[PDB]
Design an enzyme around this catalytic site. Structure first.
Site, PDB file in Angstrom:
ATOM      1  N   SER A   1      42.685  34.013  -9.494  1.00 41.25           N
ATOM      2  CA  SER A   1      42.914  33.987 -10.828  1.00 41.25           C
ATOM      3  C   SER A   1      44.021  32.882 -11.218  1.00 41.25           C
ATOM      4  CB  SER A   1      43.155  35.275 -11.421  1.00 41.25           C
ATOM      5  OG  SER A   1      43.305  35.104 -12.670  1.00 41.25           O
TER       6      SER A   1
ATOM      7  N   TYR B   1      46.730  43.302 -12.297  1.00 42.06           N
ATOM      8  CA  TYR B   1      45.539  42.048 -11.822  1.00 42.06           C
ATOM      9  C   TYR B   1      46.379  40.842 -11.361  1.00 42.06           C
ATOM     10  CZ  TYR B   1      41.372  39.518 -11.558  1.00 42.06           C
ATOM     11  OH  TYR B   1      40.056  38.875 -10.861  1.00 42.06           O
TER      12      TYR B   1
END
Lengths: 244, 245
Positions: free
Chosen positions: B152, B165
């Protein structure tokens, strides 16, 4: 840094140090106390904490308090209860130094023990996060709270054999960056990479090297002091090498 | 990634795709099959995996097999057992795409739920590692096995609200870099950052966002293809954006 601060750099600063019973954490706690800090010792071993507190008292005339917390096993509620107990006795935290950590296996990924891997992540990432979370309110009560994580060269560039430790120190850098972003203009949040320092942990990663050539925890203290004193007030979101 | 590969790019290539029922996973599985791959689907939901396999069969003429694994709760032994099942039917793995993941909480660190944090790390880091470990022998049997993790933007630069995350995707980059170093000249090990895509997870992270401003999983497939085909054989240790600035 070749940093030579005033001996009263940390007067009237309340600083919590994890892994305070040995190695770098013990040296940082003693160093901060020598520079005037009110230090709070966190560790898993009660008798070792008592000994460090006694030594600090002999050098400073001020007796540190200690609290028991084992990052391998603690829950969030354990961390919250600890923060509540600290808040009864202390009006703020001016610094939190996360030194506690687990190295785990230094071996190829194909050979990493998955239970050890999970434990390295639990100590270095999950419990370090949970403790941070519990202590944020106290840090916000400082005029300029400073939160410091321990990183590694292998938290910036992954290297063969460093397995869970590398993954955990990448995660630590990430956590530091998230926190630094969230607490812009509110906290200083940074990492220190101690480098190759003579510790029991270094005696696991390099069981065949001569420890005599390694630097002592005392040798790398300048940066530890710098991050807690006023000279670093304008630095956040960064990761520093104590000795490249 | 302007990438218009030969249509038989993945003929005779056995590729395992995890999280194969979710938006990107099911698209990657379909895409690999369209380009000739023998695809293996992995996921926690047998019902949905059967349906993805049947859709791929209808659209491409070949039916993927599937296996069940729940990354949140699986043990290393479960992963080794999966590898044993695969080895009965397949002589190697030419690719493994780790697409499975948990988003967790998108909120400030002070508000992140500690159990959710633990779960995100368990799925994205620990179980992803354990599954990788179980599959390395099969990947080594490829002429040039390709191992791909999902990252990400917040795995390269942490940002407010991305909590567990972000930490997990930093850890993913680190794990990729360790593996790439260990398997120099043996495996290709890389990450893909899909970017913002019209998917359930993206909608969960940005509940007010207009999905029309985003690319679809189909749109971002070129990089997914590139990393599994031979054009990327001399590429390892890197992290790629499916949607470059």
């Amino acid at each position: 840094m070749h940093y030579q601060p005033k001996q009263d750099l940390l007067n009237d600063r309340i600083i919590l140090v994890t892994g305070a019973s040995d190695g770098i954490g013990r040296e940082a706690a003693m160093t901060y106390a020598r520079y005037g800090a009110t230090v709070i010792l966190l560790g898993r071993n009660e008798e070792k904490l008592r000994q460090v507190a006694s030594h600090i008292n002999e050098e400073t005339g001020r007796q540190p308090q200690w609290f028991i917390l084992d990052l391998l096993t603690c829950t969030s509620e354990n961390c919250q209860q600890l923060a509540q107990r600290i808040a009864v006795n202390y009006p703020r935290l001016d610094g939190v130094l996360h030194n506690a950590g687990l190295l785990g296996d230094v071996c190829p990924m194909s050979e990493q023990n998955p239970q050890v891997w999970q434990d390295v992540m639990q100590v270095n990432v999950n419990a370090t996060f949970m403790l941070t979370q519990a202590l944020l309110p106290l840090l916000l009560k400082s005029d300029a709270g400073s939160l410091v994580f321990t990183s590694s060269s292998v938290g910036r560039q992954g290297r063969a054999n460093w397995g869970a430790y590398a993954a955990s120190k990448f995660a630590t850098e990430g956590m530091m960056q998230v926190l630094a972003d969230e607490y812009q203009q509110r906290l200083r949040v940074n990492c220190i990479n101690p480098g190759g320092t003579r510790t029991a942990m270094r005696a696991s990663a390099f069981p065949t090297e001569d420890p005599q050539k390694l630097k002592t925890p005392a040798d790398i203290m300048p940066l530890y002091l710098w991050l807690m004193g006023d000279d670093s007030r304008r630095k956040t979101g960064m990761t520093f090498d104590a000795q490249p």
